[PDB]
Amino acid sequence: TTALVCDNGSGLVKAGFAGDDAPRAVFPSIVGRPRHQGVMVGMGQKDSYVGDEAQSKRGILTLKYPIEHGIITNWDDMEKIWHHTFYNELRVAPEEHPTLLTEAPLNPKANREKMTQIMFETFNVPAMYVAIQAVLSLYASGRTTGIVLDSGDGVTHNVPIYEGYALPHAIMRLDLAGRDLTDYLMKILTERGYSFVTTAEREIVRDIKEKLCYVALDFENEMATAASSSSLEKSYELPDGQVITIGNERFRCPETLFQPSFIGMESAGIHETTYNSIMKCDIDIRKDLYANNVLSGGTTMYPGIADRMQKEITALAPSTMKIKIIAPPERKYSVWIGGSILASLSTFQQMWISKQEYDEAGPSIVHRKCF
Amino acid sequence: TTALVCDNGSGLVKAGFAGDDAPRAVFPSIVGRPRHQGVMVGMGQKDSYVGDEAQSKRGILTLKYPIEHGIITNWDDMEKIWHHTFYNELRVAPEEHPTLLTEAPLNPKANREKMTQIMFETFNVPAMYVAIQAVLSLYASGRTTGIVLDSGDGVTHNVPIYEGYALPHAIMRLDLAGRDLTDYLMKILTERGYSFVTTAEREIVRDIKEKLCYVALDFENEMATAASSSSLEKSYELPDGQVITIGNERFRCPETLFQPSFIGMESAGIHETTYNSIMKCDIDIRKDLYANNVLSGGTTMYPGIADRMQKEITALAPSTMKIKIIAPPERKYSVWIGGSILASLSTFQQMWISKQEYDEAGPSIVHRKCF
Amino acid sequence: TTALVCDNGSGLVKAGFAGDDAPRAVFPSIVGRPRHQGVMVGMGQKDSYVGDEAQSKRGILTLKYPIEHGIITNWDDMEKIWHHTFYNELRVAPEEHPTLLTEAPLNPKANREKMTQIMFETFNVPAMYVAIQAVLSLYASGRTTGIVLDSGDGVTHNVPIYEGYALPHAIMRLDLAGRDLTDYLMKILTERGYSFVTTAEREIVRDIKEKLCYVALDFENEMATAASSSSLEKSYELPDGQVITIGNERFRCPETLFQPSFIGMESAGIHETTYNSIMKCDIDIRKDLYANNVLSGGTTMYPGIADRMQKEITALAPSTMKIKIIAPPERKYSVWIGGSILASLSTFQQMWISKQEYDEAGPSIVHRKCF
Amino acid sequence: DKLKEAETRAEFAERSVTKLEKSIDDLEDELYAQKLKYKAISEELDHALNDMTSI
Amino acid sequence: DKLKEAETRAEFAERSVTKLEKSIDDLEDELYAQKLKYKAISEELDHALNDMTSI
Ligand SMILES: Nc1ncnc2c1ncn2[C@@H]1O[C@H](COP(=O)(O)OP(=O)(O)O)[C@@H](O)[C@H]1O
Ligand SMILES: Nc1ncnc2c1ncn2[C@@H]1O[C@H](COP(=O)(O)OP(=O)(O)O)[C@@H](O)[C@H]1O
């Protein structure tokens, strides 16, 4: 039979059968209970709208993501999300399909063990396998080397790989991602008068960020230009009218990636954690990693980031090496495409964690040889 | 010469010369045009009564506050209020006195720039400086660390400070304040038969709230007690007779602070936004912030709030830390006392925005080094 | 007059007058500039807190060690540290006191030359001498032979000495030390959910390592025991509450010393570089080196290391030789005690690099006869 | 008047409140100091036993 | 008028002292219990060392 390539993510759940080009169903991972009282009788009001249904009734819900930073903080809601994904968005019972979840690097063990225990006890799948979210993104590019920066919505991690041999001592995981950029944008919009507070209006700020923000090639020059002319002010129409005008908030929101001091984080930007991740590698594979830097994940879709990052790394790196940044147009679904490719391989067909194996060793089987 | 420490606030304008203990003139900030026709000739009827004069003729006026939530929505009325404050309540021409306004955190820029432009062009002061309303309240307590919850009448904001270094990423500004409590009290009084609608009767409801309401130590027990006995029903005499009896409306009005779901607001109460503001701080200064929690602002004068808040935070916080809530008896004027202390300092004497500096850089000088 | 026995080290600066038993002032060598903005005026905020002062205000600083691996990477900060050490922790002007610095073996020349140039030009000492950090640790033991393994916090080096004649071709310097163990512990703590990222929280992880970690006598048996029972899980209270429980991370952090493959280093552990250092020596002094193996440095203070190392060497060495490991209780300050003894000798009194000699030959005098 | 017979009490409770607040602040501080000392002593005993743990 | 103010102020004034009194005595009792705990822990190993004094 065919395998189910699910990809929990944090912000958008992407799923679909193995062997295709794009995920079959992509929908936000939010579960929102209603918060008001409700007076109409017999309206058929449910107790929790999940997935894309709660992005249409969000006016009277309190949306809450079940995955904070890679890790899962609310297991009941995550189980509800998985149940919805299997039964309503794909309509395939899990009793007859292997599953291939994905997990960020350096995550707590208990999260992974609970994930496999749920998949084997509640949904009762035949066999499931958990894979690191960066190796798949490297599969999708058709490479076999390269250092991949997978800046998702929950957590940004940077896994270097050479000739198929991952370097476990050079993984640099940073917890700045799309959600913190949404919060920072929502916080700097208040400098013009627009106040978004409700958890429903966070979605509106996210839409503003997606449609308007861009990464500046040079920050100081843009700050000077936006403060003199008015060629940058782009307007946007809220879900009820009252258009708003975003000035130099456009390139200040995604600039947080390269200067995490804006949101008070100490660490260095995504332009310098990649160079540090490279320098921890051996001295003889640094040229190949320099030449095959891969971008993935949703948050790396800002217009103009593949040039800013290349300029920064070229500034840091030695002058002789060639710096090349692979930015495929299908960046958002790169991890899932790689997952489909991996699940479609014949050599991989014996790596699944078969159910009888789980019955013999318990949920701690995932840390064992079947990784 | 001496400095003028004005403090616009929202609900009560407090002003006075720097270096004293209490503001010289405290009066509501309302400007009310008459609304009826007027038949007596030569009575000397003015077109707008401002300040404390319109709290005595409020029977035939339509009072309207010029400051909604920290921000200023009606600049002409605010200019009128400032003119009254300078010329009639203090009787000092502004041409010979520096001014020190105060502003809530996270307010729109245009508000601050317009404020400085007015002060420099219309009143023509020698030099003015704008300060955040929470740092002053921290000055007045004589501390140098601590997280201050300044629940005014317009907006409640919670600024944590350590060793004099403010943490800009941990400011949690919430727009529930005394005015919303007045409106909610006016809305729940209708459950007994008393209807207050006119903008003049909002003042009567405010007086009821000030004199009778108190914060319950435990909400459910009080709700149960008030529903069985009658030891809580306190009566109050309206401005014309017809005494009224307030039952369990006494502790239900200020309970909205700890459960903003009562007035339909989504966010968490003032007992949980303080804990969230602390948890955003670094891991090594949380003990000091726990031990030096400061209360300020008018709305924190409810009898019994310094115990309810301590109980709530002790429930949330780890069991080992000591939770202490500083509630000085001079809470209402804490911001202004701190402003006087700051204006009286010698080290601060060179931070004023001198007029020649404004002439060279325009009103946008306030966002620059002279903050 | 008396000599100043300073000992730069990397992690703790230990200093004191010659002829005593213990260093007078021991304090971490970190210089941390503040990173937030700072709103209180006149608080007397300095621009850089050094030494033990920055271990109390570390909540709002960005601590950065000026010595990476023995070598000094930031000369201005090191000069600041020395100035603090002389003037505030000892309160003796350097114009009237000889100094005896210490330096790791096989360090870059430029580091040593710059050190002597600073000591002679800025602080203007009468005479300074630089000594290898292992010979002093051999002095303190009262021996005259033996192979000393001085596993500091920056770099671990293993200098064999016989009858006072050092063997320059048998020094094995390895760059794994306490700092890498701190980083590895901070990296494996993430497997339970505790994430420490800030440079201030590295100090908390260091405290955890010091107070809880221990070296296992047999690694596999401990890994099996910790995975079945729960007699090892020791808890620890963070600087704000929220106790944490360390499981088999206790003996996995310091195990990196004997298996440097954990942090990706190729080389062999400290149990096998000592045997290799012995085998490079001549065939007739191997028995004495076997019998007089000396431990020193801070990182060799783990509970149970003097038995694991002896077991390992006994496994490697021929069965007839007796293996003895000298582990004095005053291990941490062994180098400084030896430095005091050496500076107190009469025979050594003419080996100092007198200032007139430096004036005649420049800073390159240190490599000359006055070593 | 009837004012003073209560104002006498009104001011009276001020010093009461001041004494109570300073006393309780000192009490909690010294109690926490004692608890910290006891914790230190207990940890000293246990970890001194465990640093020994036979030699 | 001001009479009512005086009555209310005095009536609320009595509230704070009496409630704080019980807390003060509870603090004293807990402090003393902890001090007794420490003293009991203090003398034991003290005498143990007294025996261990020069063995
Ligand atoms: N076109 C876009 N431009 C800018 N940002 C985007 C765009 N699309 C998505 N994002 C950001 O990326 C996030 C989605 O990232 P995604 O790759 O789905 O995360 P995950 O790894 O959890 O699947 C969204 O929250 C959004 O903030
Ligand atoms: N004694 C009191 N008891 C309860 N509430 C009060 C009391 N005094 C003032 N308030 C509330 O506080 C508000 C005044 O707050 P204030 O601190 O003057 O605001 P601002 O920060 O604008 O100066 C009033 O509107 C009133 O609702």
Ligand SMILES: Nc1ncnc2c1ncn2[C@@H]1O[C@H](COP(=O)(O)OP(=O)(O)O)[C@@H](O)[C@H]1O
């Ligand atoms: N009691 C202890 N137990 C375990 N490790 C320790 C202990 N004391 C110090 N260390 C480690 O040793 C380091 C201090 O080593 P030290 O000898 O001061 O280095 P240096 O040679 O630079 O002086 C610390 O960073 C710490 O990691």
Ligand SMILES: [Mg+2]
């Ligand atoms: Mg992803």
Ligand SMILES: [Mg+2]
């Ligand atoms: Mg105020």
Ligand SMILES: [Mg+2]
């Ligand atoms: Mg050393």
